[PDB]
């Protein structure tokens, strides 16, 4: 991947705010459906995603475009809404975190530019 202004913003602003939030703990690591006794989790959820995985990807310059990282955040929230019951508190926690995600994304740099200054 590469380092861009937008991906650096996603790492140092958006992820920093979401990771520390009081509602982040269910999303800081992949769902362990074996330990949770949930044999249907991976039958229903085709693309598991979590903030621990996203954070490691950002640390390792896995992404090529901010939009890919935004899709990973979105998949994580969508998985929660699809799998759980509409009245479960975790749905409310995801809605709270996703609202912060969108609020912070609103102030991301407009044009994606690689943060490299190279010598030919
Ligand atoms: C999946 C459906 C839905 C959903 O959509 N998502 C995203 C979701 C995600 N996560 C959870 N639960 C947990 C999440 C995280 C933890 C944790 O801190 N786990 C660590 C704590 C102990 C650690 N151990 C390991 C070895 N230990 C050494 C030996 C002495 C013990 C020392 C400590 C290992 C794991 C616990 C959870 O269970 C309480 N539920 C979810 N739901 C619920 C509605 C079921």
From TrEMBL:
Signal peptide: none
UniProt subcellular location: Chromosome; Nucleus
Domain Bromo: 19-91
Annotated transmembrane regions: none
Domain of life according to the entry: Eukaryota
Subunit-level organization: Homodimer. Interacts with E2F1. Interacts with (acetylated) STAT3; promoting STAT3 recruitment to chromatin. Interacts with CTCF; promoting BRD2 recruitment to chromatin.
This protein's name: Bromodomain-containing protein 2
Species of origin: Homo sapiens (Human)
GN (gene name): BRD2
């Amino acid at each position: 991947g590469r380092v861009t202004n937008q991906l650096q913003y996603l790492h140092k602003v958006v992820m920093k705010a979401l990771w520390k939030h009081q509602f982040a703990w269910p999303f800081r690591q992949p769902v362990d459906a074996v330990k949770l006794g949930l044999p249907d989790y991976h039958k229903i959820i085709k693309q598991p995603m979590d903030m621990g995985t996203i954070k490691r990807r950002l640390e390792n310059n896995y992404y090529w475009a901010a939009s890919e990282c935004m899709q990973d955040f979105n998949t994580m929230f969508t998985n929660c809404y699809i799998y759980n019951k509409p009245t479960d508190d975790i749905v409310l926690m995801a809605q709270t975190l996703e609202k912060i995600f969108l609020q912070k994304v609103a102030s991301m740099p407009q044009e994606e530019q690689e943060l490299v200054v190279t010598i030919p």
